[PDB]
Structures are given as structure tokens and as C-alpha cells.
Design a protein around this ligand. Structure first.
Ligand SMILES: NC(=O)C1=CN([C@@H]2O[C@H](COP(=O)(O)OP(=O)(O)OC[C@H]3O[C@@H](n4cnc5c(N)ncnc54)[C@H](OP(=O)(O)O)[C@@H]3O)[C@@H](O)[C@H]2O)C=CC1
Length: 337
């Protein structure tokens, strides 16, 4: 197997120097285990945090160890378990060609699943994140105003479309005119505001004439600063991500606003709740899968995928992913099936 290992921990934004490409002898499938060969590899913003050694919900990637991530693989070794040579499976083998496994995969067998790569997006972790965060924490009611940034991304597009079918007025936030116009034309968003526009806060306040009832937080920073004075009484904030600060080297200057945010949550009676989808939500995944399969069949969910070819290109893609260079859920094709 070839491999993308972490050469050095990045300073600010990650560079191509922080990664390295290396071959390794990948055999020993053994008895009781299996050898998986990857076809697709997901790239996700959380991986940035895994490059830094700051105290976090998970262990950082060790120097010269494989970079982590969910993959869609095929079995190529006779598993002694209940999986055959050919069964497609959603695994977590990282940025490499081969790995050895023995639970807990998810059979998409195979070897003829319809859209196996969808297991990394709309039917996988990002769609599940959007589903759970919006429905269980945001708890949308008819007439609620829903605002989400990174609106054409893996999680944001799903948040917006689910909110639309749940009776929300959905205000998107994205970077650049093309993404906002795609969010309106194809994803069904009522509005979509360019956060790169100089008068972004004023545009947001203008289209949010009735306030914000749910803010699905994906970005933080300037976007949340513009959102705060528009929050309604009883608003809900599913705290999903804060990508605007993933490359931050220090805290912003100026006076400490922590007590200010706490006073706002108190005065406006707001629920702000962080969540990590990788926690045990096994009791909800079946409901999510049934609902999302139905909504996809009904034509209420458009899933945009950004497929880039070549595992050797996986670093650069990831870097671009952090700057909004992606259009949709970023996936790298590592091998032909
Ligand atoms: N809590 C959980 O368990 C999970 C959390 N997440 C979080 O959800 C968020 C998005 O996930 P995903 O949809 O996969 O990523 P995307 O597929 O949305 O791509 C990331 C997007 O972030 C946006 N972005 C990056 N920097 C900035 C910035 N400084 N200001 C505004 N927007 C920015 C860009 O969209 P644009 O071009 O519009 O700026 C970029 O395309 C991330 O924060 C991620 O960490 C993801 C999965 C699960």
C-alpha cells in the first residue's frame, strides 16, 4: 500500500510539506481478519485538528503515521468473519491503499452497490451529522428561520434541505456568488448570503427580518458575530463545527466576550449544544438511513460530490477543502474497482 503520512504538524494553514507519500509492504491478512483495498477516501475538516497535538476529543495523528479518515473499500482477502471477497464496506482505513480489518465495518455489498461513495456523504457521516444536529438539537418547527453557513458543503447542504422539507425558511451563508446561487437554484435555499461580501452582516440582517430561530453553527468567527444580534428568543444553536478557527494561531484581541455570550444565552433563553456524531448514536442511525433514503428517492435531497482523482492528490485537495476550494463533499478516488 501507498500511504499519506503526517510529516510535521502544521503552523496556521497546512502546507504540502506537512504530508509525505510512502510505500509500505501491505500483506498479512491473517485468519480471523481481512484485507481491505480502498476505492474512495473522504476528506473532512476535522482532520485539520488531528494534525495538531492540542488536547482534543481524540488522539492526534502521530508523526509519520497514516492520516486518518473514513473510506469505502472492497474486501480482497478471504475474511474468516462474515464478509466475502467482493463485499463493499464503509471502513476507516485512512489515506492508504490497503488495511487489515475485523469489525466494525458496514456492508454495502456488493460487489454491485449503486452509489457506494455516497456512504461517505449524504448516506454517511456528514448527512447523519446534519440530520441529528438539526432534528434532535435544533428541533425545527414550522415557520422557524434556519441559518447555516458552509451552505453548499457536506453538512450544510443537508441541514438546509432537511430544514426546507421540515417547513423552515432557510437562509444560507456561503463563500462567493457561485455557491450562493447554487444554494438557491439547486439546493432550494430561500436565500444565501456571501460571507466574503464587504457588507455581509448588513445583508444577513436584511434578509433575516424576522430574526433567527435556529443557527446550525459550522464556522464561528465573523459569521457567528454577524448572527448573534439576529438571534431570537428561544433560539437553538446546534454546535457542529468552527472551521474559521481551525487554522488559528491565537485568540482574537479586544475585551473578553465570554461572559457577553453567556449573558446573551441567558437573556434570549438560547440552547447552545455541541455534539460529535462519532459518539454512540447507533439507536438513531437506522431512522436516519430510512428517512434519508426516502428523501433522496422523493427528490427532496440533492447531493453534490466533489470527486478528485489520485490519492497522491489527497493532501492538496484537503488544503483546498479548508479554504472553500471544494464544491460539495470532497472525496478522493484512490483506486479503480
Ligand atoms: N460535529 C461533528 O461531529 C461534525 C462536525 N463537522 C463540522 O462541520 C463543518 C463542515 O463540515 P463539511 O460540510 O464536511 O465541510 P465542507 O464540506 O462544508 O467544506 C468546508 C467548508 O467550510 C467553509 N469555510 C472554510 N473556512 C471558512 C471561513 N473562514 N469562513 C466561512 N466559511 C468557511 C467553506 O465553504 P465556503 O466556500 O461557503 O466558505 C468550505 O467549503 C466543519 O466545521 C466540520 O468540522 C463535520 C462533520 C461532523
Amino acid at each position: 500500500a501507498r500511504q499519506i503520512v503526517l510529516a510535521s504538524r502544521p503552523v496556521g494553514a497546512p502546507t504540502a510539506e506537512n504530508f509525505a507519500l510512502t510505500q509500505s509492504d501491505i500483506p498479512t491478512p491473517a485468519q480471523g481478519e481481512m484485507l481491505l483495498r480502498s476505492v474512495y477516501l473522504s476528506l473532512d475538516p476535522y482532520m485539520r485538528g488531528r494534525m495538531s497535538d492540542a488536547k482534543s476529543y481524540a488522539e492526534p495523528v502521530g508523526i509519520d503515521e497514516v492520516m486518518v479518515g473514513g473510506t469505502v473499500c472492497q474486501v480482497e482477502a478471504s475474511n474468516h468473519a462474515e464478509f466475502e471477497v467482493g463485499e463493499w464496506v464503509l471502513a476507516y482505513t485512512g489515506w492508504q491503499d490497503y488495511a487489515i480489518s475485523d469489525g466494525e465495518g458496514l456492508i454495502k455489498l456488493g460487489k454491485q452497490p449503486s452509489h457506494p461513495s455516497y456512504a461517505l456523504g449524504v448516506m454517511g457521516m456528514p448527512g447523519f451529522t446534519a440530520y441529528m444536529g438539526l432534528l434532535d438539537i435544533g428541533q425545527p418547527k414550522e415557520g422557524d428561520t434556519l441559518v447555516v453557513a458552509a451552505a453548499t458543503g457536506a453538512v450544510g447542504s443537508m441541514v438546509g434541505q432537511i430544514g426546507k422539507l421540515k417547513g423552515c425558511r432557510v437562509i444560507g451563508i456561503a463563500g462567493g456568488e457561485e455557491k450562493c446561487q447554487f444554494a438557491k437554484d439547486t439546493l432550494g435555499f430561500d436565500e444565501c448570503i456571501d460571507h466574503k461580501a464587504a457588507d455581509f452582516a448588513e445583508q444577513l440582517a436584511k434578509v433575516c427580518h424576522n430574526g433567527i430561530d435556529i443557527y446550525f453553527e459550522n464556522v464561528g468567527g465573523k459569521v457567528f458575530d454577524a448572527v448573534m444580534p439576529l438571534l431570537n428568543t428561544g433560539a437553538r444553536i446546534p454546535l457542529c463545527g468552527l472551521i474559521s478557527q481551525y487554522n488559528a494561531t491565537s485568540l482574537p484581541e479586544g475585551p473578553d466576550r465570554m461572559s457577553m455570550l453567556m449573558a446573551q444565552l441567558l437573556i434570549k433563553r438560547i440552547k447552545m449544544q455541541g455534539f460529535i456524531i462519532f459518539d454512540d448514536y447507533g439507536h438513531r442511525y437506522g431512522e436516519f438511513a430510512a428517512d434519508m433514503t426516502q428523501w433522496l428517492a422523493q427528490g427532496k435531497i440533492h447531493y453534490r460530490e466533489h470527486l478528485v482523482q489520485g490519492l497522491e492528490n489527497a493532501p492538496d485537495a484537503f488544503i483546498g477543502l479548508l479554504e472553500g476550494k471544494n464544491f460539495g463533499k470532497m472525496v478522493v478516488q484512490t483506486n479503480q474497482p
